[PDB]
Write a protein that holds these residues in place. Sequence first.
Motif, PDB file in Angstrom:
ATOM      1  N   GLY A   1       0.803  -1.203   0.000  1.00  0.00           N
ATOM      2  CA  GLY A   1       0.000   0.000   0.000  1.00  0.00           C
ATOM      3  C   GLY A   1       0.841   1.260   0.000  1.00  0.00           C
ATOM      4  N   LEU A   2       2.157   1.123   0.139  1.00  0.00           N
ATOM      5  CA  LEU A   2       3.003   2.309   0.151  1.00  0.00           C
ATOM      6  C   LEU A   2       3.981   2.375  -1.026  1.00  0.00           C
ATOM      7  CD1 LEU A   2       3.724   2.953   3.957  1.00  0.00           C
ATOM      8  CD2 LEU A   2       2.226   4.205   2.412  1.00  0.00           C
ATOM      9  N   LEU A   3       3.592   1.756  -2.142  1.00  0.00           N
ATOM     10  CA  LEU A   3       4.324   1.833  -3.399  1.00  0.00           C
ATOM     11  C   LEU A   3       3.326   2.054  -4.523  1.00  0.00           C
ATOM     12  CD1 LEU A   3       6.734  -1.220  -2.979  1.00  0.00           C
ATOM     13  CD2 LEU A   3       7.304   1.232  -2.726  1.00  0.00           C
ATOM     14  N   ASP A   4       3.809   2.574  -5.639  1.00  0.00           N
ATOM     15  CA  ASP A   4       3.008   2.662  -6.861  1.00  0.00           C
ATOM     16  C   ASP A   4       3.917   2.632  -8.076  1.00  0.00           C
ATOM     17  OD1 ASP A   4       3.929   5.308  -7.224  1.00  0.00           O
ATOM     18  OD2 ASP A   4       1.932   6.241  -7.038  1.00  0.00           O
ATOM     19  N   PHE A   5       3.286   2.651  -9.249  1.00  0.00           N
ATOM     20  CA  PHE A   5       4.021   2.554 -10.490  1.00  0.00           C
ATOM     21  C   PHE A   5       5.095   3.632 -10.636  1.00  0.00           C
ATOM     22  CE2 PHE A   5       4.826   3.860 -14.815  1.00  0.00           C
ATOM     23  CZ  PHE A   5       5.271   2.671 -15.385  1.00  0.00           C
ATOM     24  N   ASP A   6       4.789   4.871 -10.261  1.00  0.00           N
ATOM     25  CA  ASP A   6       5.784   5.947 -10.440  1.00  0.00           C
ATOM     26  C   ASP A   6       7.058   5.684  -9.636  1.00  0.00           C
ATOM     27  OD1 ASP A   6       4.092   7.493 -12.089  1.00  0.00           O
ATOM     28  OD2 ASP A   6       3.159   8.443 -10.346  1.00  0.00           O
ATOM     29  N   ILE A   7       6.896   5.175  -8.410  1.00  0.00           N
ATOM     30  CA  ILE A   7       8.069   4.915  -7.567  1.00  0.00           C
ATOM     31  C   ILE A   7       8.879   3.748  -8.182  1.00  0.00           C
ATOM     32  CG2 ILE A   7       8.845   4.120  -5.294  1.00  0.00           C
ATOM     33  CD1 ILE A   7       6.125   5.431  -4.239  1.00  0.00           C
ATOM     34  N   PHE A   8       8.181   2.687  -8.606  1.00  0.00           N
ATOM     35  CA  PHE A   8       8.845   1.561  -9.259  1.00  0.00           C
ATOM     36  C   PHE A   8       9.569   2.013 -10.537  1.00  0.00           C
ATOM     37  CE2 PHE A   8       9.472  -2.899 -10.024  1.00  0.00           C
ATOM     38  CZ  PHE A   8       9.264  -3.117 -11.362  1.00  0.00           C
ATOM     39  N   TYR A   9       8.913   2.842 -11.340  1.00  0.00           N
ATOM     40  CA  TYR A   9       9.503   3.374 -12.577  1.00  0.00           C
ATOM     41  C   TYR A   9      10.814   4.139 -12.318  1.00  0.00           C
ATOM     42  CZ  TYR A   9      10.101   6.182 -16.800  1.00  0.00           C
ATOM     43  OH  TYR A   9      10.605   6.854 -17.899  1.00  0.00           O
ATOM     44  N   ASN A  10      10.775   5.053 -11.354  1.00  0.00           N
ATOM     45  CA  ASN A  10      11.971   5.760 -10.978  1.00  0.00           C
ATOM     46  C   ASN A  10      13.109   4.847 -10.615  1.00  0.00           C
ATOM     47  OD1 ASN A  10      10.591   8.179 -11.422  1.00  0.00           O
ATOM     48  ND2 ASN A  10      10.364   8.682  -9.235  1.00  0.00           N
ATOM     49  N   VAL A  11      12.800   3.824  -9.828  1.00  0.00           N
ATOM     50  CA  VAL A  11      13.832   2.883  -9.333  1.00  0.00           C
ATOM     51  C   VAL A  11      14.358   2.035 -10.499  1.00  0.00           C
ATOM     52  CG1 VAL A  11      14.419   1.069  -7.718  1.00  0.00           C
ATOM     53  CG2 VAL A  11      13.055   3.043  -6.964  1.00  0.00           C
ATOM     54  N   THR A  12      13.485   1.648 -11.425  1.00  0.00           N
ATOM     55  CA  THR A  12      14.028   0.936 -12.608  1.00  0.00           C
ATOM     56  C   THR A  12      14.937   1.826 -13.469  1.00  0.00           C
ATOM     57  OG1 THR A  12      12.117   1.333 -14.098  1.00  0.00           O
ATOM     58  CG2 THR A  12      12.088  -0.676 -12.686  1.00  0.00           C
TER      59      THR A  12
END
Length: 233
Positions: A161-172
């Motif tokens: 519940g404390l992650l989303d696509f934008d955060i994952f995208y940045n990290v990739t």
Amino acid sequence: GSNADMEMTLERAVSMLEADHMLPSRISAAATFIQHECFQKSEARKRVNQLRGILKLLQLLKVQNEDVQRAVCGALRNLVFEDNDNKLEVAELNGVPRLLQVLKQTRDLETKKQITGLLWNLSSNDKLKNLMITEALLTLTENIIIPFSGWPEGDYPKANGLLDFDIFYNVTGCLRNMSSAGADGRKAMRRCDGLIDSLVHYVRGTIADYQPDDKATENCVCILHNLSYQLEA
């Protein structure tokens, strides 16, 4: 200059980042001013460096207030954008571990997007890629990539519940840049438990779910080209 007035300038803003008052409105007004000025002005990013503002902002990551953290992390992301001196100075001041601590602790999604975008900006500097592997590889893999990926499928992991696509995208994007390091850096990433498996799983899930234009998948494919090889024994 200021003669008992509140007309904001970069100089007044940096002056308001005194470390000890811990007044959220003062810090937030000053750091958002810097954030806004550095959004599209290269000269503002150089000026905050000259005024010694980068360390002052990093010192205020200690402040446990969500508005303060959004202002400080938003400011720092904009300060390092396309500015190599600022990227190097954040790294040299041990900014990465402090930023990672906030990334783990905060309950604010936007703060996580700012920190992860900031790190992504750091990672495009060739001199910082091995440093980013040393400092950030494990935290980024375990806090963001692994949980968001859904890997392993057969273990039916809960949603986060404390992650989303934008955060994952940045990290990739971060990891894509880091995976262009040299061989010793790539070996560390390849051997980071669960990293490769999670990226592979994400890629395959976006195929099955008909998301052919997913930009995080594009980053994952690039990371995997850079990392997915072994040397014969």
